[PDB]
Design a protein around this nucleic acid. Structure first.
Length: 94
RNA sequence: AUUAAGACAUUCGUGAGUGAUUUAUUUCCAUGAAGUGGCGU
């Protein structure tokens, strides 16, 4: 973990998401750059580059509670949506 | 020399005056920026 990061910046080290593996490494385009630490060999330390953080294709975003608005002039459609909406989100990922 | 001779159906006169090619009509409908890990047993 680089010990200089924005307060909203967090990492999931081992995840099934294996795209964007170049975001941590050697090249200057990487968001987090690993170089061999001084003194002791191995046990490299990481540096956070905010400029590369901005130009990342995908980010893991978690928000507070947010609203979903469904509009329909058909009352029976809305009431059927109300029954199935809690089940729909439980059964699906996005 | 004979109910005869002379006599432009002609003069003046704008097819002109008023008039919105306008009123009504959603470039909209459907659609996952997604899929997958691999090798070092």
């Amino acid at each position: 973990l680089p010990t200089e990061r924005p307060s909203n910046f967090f990492t999931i080290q081992n995840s099934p998401y294996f795209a964007q593996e170049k975001c941590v490494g050697i090249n200057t385009n990487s968001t987090i750059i690993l170089k061999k630490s001084n003194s002791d060999p191995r046990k490299k330390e990481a540096e956070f580059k905010e400029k590369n953080w901005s130009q990342i294709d995908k980010k893991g975003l978690e928000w507070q509670d947010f609203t979903i608005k469904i509009f329909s002039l058909k009352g029976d459609l809305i009431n059927k949506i109300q029954t199935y909406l809690p089940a729909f989100f439980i059964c699906h990922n996005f």
